[PDB]
Each structure stands twice: as structure tokens, then as C-alpha cells.
Amino acid sequence: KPQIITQPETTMAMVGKDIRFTCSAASSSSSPMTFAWKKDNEVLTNADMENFVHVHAVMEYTTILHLRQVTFGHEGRYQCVITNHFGSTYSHKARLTVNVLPSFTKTPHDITIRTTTMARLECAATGHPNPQIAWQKDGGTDFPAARERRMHVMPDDDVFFITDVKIDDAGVYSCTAQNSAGSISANATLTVLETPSLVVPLEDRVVSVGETVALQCKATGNPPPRITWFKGDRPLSLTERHHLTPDNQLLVVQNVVAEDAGRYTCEMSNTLGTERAHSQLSVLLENLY
Ligand SMILES: *[C@@H]1O[C@H](CO)[C@@H](O)[C@H](O)[C@H]1NC(C)=O
């Protein structure tokens, strides 16, 4: 009749680390006690046990089963058995399961993509139990591809993709793999560009000598396109009568003159390419001299 005080509790351990089970008992008598541990109903001979004694004023003896450098083979159901000259006491059964920290097999890398195309992000990890993959943009969740349900994943090939890439999709994306052991994460910067284009069409104009004409070239694209104006096929020579906004988008010519007639070309460029828009300016002449 050795009466158990502390019973071994079910626990989890990471592979490679040490773990321990403890049960402690105290006999009604002073007859010596013997501790045993039986895994899956088969004892460990050559087992690593360590024994302690407590002096409560009762002599409580504690036994510790050391499991050094745990592997998957250590996985099982453990129990402590205490024997004296009276009888044997049996403890609760404690389960031991094992962890393996997640390790990346595929990480996303920095890419530069155009608008309206499809961006692909690879990300996979091993580990026990199998890790779940989570995503972040700039450290959060309020990002357009998620909010607009445009981000998806291939079913069995571990590939994430975004359809119809917006400008606001650009930023740092963080891939995070997590299980019951821990978390790891990898960054990838998505950079989104757009070829230059015209917002509103550039229309032909017809004005009379002395009137004022205005040509607007509202250009989009990323990076913001540099705008250059041309008359004929030479760069536009500016006068006191010519006006430009700093962005060069609005071109105004006051007091139009016969020499002003001709084709005005709007040239929009960035690192992706160049687009052009044309406007024919016709002038209604009353008298040349
Ligand atoms: C991942 O990105 C976050 C936020 O951009 C940053 O704080 C962290 O240092 C990055 N980690 C690495 C390894 O670059």
C-alpha cells in the first residue's frame, strides 16, 4: 500500500529535447519502495530514473523518468508502478506526443509585376504536426487582395496567386508557418508597375486666331510618367503665350497664331515604355497680315 501523491501528467515534447514524468508516493510503513515505469505495458530496462526524497513535518519519495533526446519512438503511453512489501500501486496513464518545428521548403521571393496580370507566391513547410500557412501584407490583414477575394491557393501544389493585380497590392507580404511547436516566417516584396496610358482621350481642336486653346494630357501609370510635348516632330518651343502646369499635363496657348497650327504630340514615358497621344490643332485664319 504505497499511496501516490503526485501522478504523472500528460505532456508534449519537441524532438531532440529532454522531457520528464514524475510520480511521488509515501508508504504507511518504513519498508523500502521500488519504482518502475512501464511504457505501452512493456517496461524500459536500461531506463533513466532519478529519485528524490521530501521531508514533510511523512517521507514522500519522488521518482523521475528521464527521456533524453526524444524521438518519435518515445511516443506512447506511460505509467508508474510503486512496489513495497505490502502491494503494488498503479498510476494514471500519461500520453507523450512529440513536436517538430516547421521548416520552409519553398519561400516567396521579391517580384515586379504589371497591373491586371496575375501574381504567384510559393510557400510551403514541413513539420509535425503539419503546419498551417498564414499570410500578411505590411504586417496586417486589411489588404485589398484578401478584402476583395482575389487571392487564392492551388489545392495540392502549395501555390498562392493573386488575380487582377491592383496598384494597392504592392507591399511586403509575410508568409507564416505555424504548429504547436512554433512559428517561422518569410518576407517577399511585391512591386507593381503600370505602363503609361491616357485617362481621358486627347481630342483634336479647332480655334480662331486670337482665341485660347487648352490641351490636357492626364497620364497614369507607375512610376508616374514624365510628359513631354511636341509640335510636328520637334519638341515644343515655348513662348510668352504658352503655359504649362508643373506636371506638364495641361498645355495652354493664349492668343493663337497661324504658326501654332499643326499636330501636338503628348509623349508619356516611364521605365516600362512610352505611349503617345496626338492632337491636331487647326486654326481659322481671317487674314495672315
Ligand atoms: C519581414 O518584414 C517585417 C515587416 O516588413 C520586418 O519587420 C522584418 O524585419 C522582416 N524580416 C526579415 C527577415 O527581413
**Which of 135, 174, 185, when mutated, tests ligand 1's pocket best, judged by the most ligand atoms within 8 Å of its CB?**
174
Which residue's CA is the nearest one to ligand 1's atom 8? 187
What are the residue boundaries of the structural domains of the chain, listed by start? 1-100, 101-195, 196-289
Reference 254, options 266, 243, 265; nearest CA is: 243
CATH class of 1-100: mainly beta
193 sits in the region (left: phi over 0; alpha: psi -120 to 50; else beta) called beta
The three cell numbers locating residue 141: 490583414
Whole-number Å distance, alpha carbon 109 to ligand 1 midpoint, is: 13
In three-state form (DSSP H/G/I as H, E/B as E, the rest C), the secondary structure along the chain is CEEEEECCCCEEEECCCCEEEEEEEEECCCCCCEEEEEECCEECCCCEEEEEEEECCCEEEEEEEEECCCCHHHCEEEEEEEECCCCEEECCCEEEEEEEEEEEEECCCCEEEECCCCEEEECEEEEECCCEEEEEECCECCCHHHHCCCEEECCCCCEEEECCCCHHHCEEEEEEEECCCCEEEEEEEEEEEEEEEECCCCCCEEEECCCCEEEECCEEEECCCEEEEEECCEECCCCCCEEECCCCCEEEECCCCHHHCEEEEEEEEECCEEEEEEEEEEEECCCCC
- Beta carbons of 119 and 33 less than 8 angstroms apart: no
List all residues 6 or more positions away from 175 whose beta carbon is below 8 Å from its beta carbon: 107, 108, 121, 123, 133, 134, 135, 185, 186, 187, 188
- Closest atom of ligand 1 relative to the 172 alpha carbon: 5
Q: Which method, experimentally, gave rise to this model? A: X-ray
Resolution in A: 2.8
Whole-number Å distance, alpha carbon 168 to ligand 1 midpoint, is: 19
Amino acid at 90: Y
24: Cα separation from own chain's centroid: 48
Q: What are phi and psi of 74, to 5 degrees?
A: -75, -15
Bridge-based pairing of strands 19-27 and 2-6 is: antiparallel
State which CATH number among 2.60.120.1440, 2.60.40.10, 3.40.50.1000, 3.40.50.720 fits the domain covering 196-289: 2.60.40.10
Amino acid at 250: L
Return d(Cα 205, Cα 278) in angstroms, integer: 11
Whole-number Å distance, alpha carbon 281 to ligand 1 midpoint, is: 54
Q: Is the dihedral of CA 40, 41, 45, 46 positive or negative?
A: positive
Task: Say whether 196-289 and 1-100 share the same fold.
Answer: yes
Return d(Cα 87, Cα 113) in angstroms, integer: 76
Sheet holding 262-270, edge to edge: 205-208, 273-284, 262-270, 226-231, 234-235
Whole-number Å distance, alpha carbon 144 to ligand 1 midpoint, is: 20
Residues framing ligand 1 (Cβ under 6 A): 139, 172, 174, 187
Fold of 101-195: Immunoglobulin-like (2.60.40)
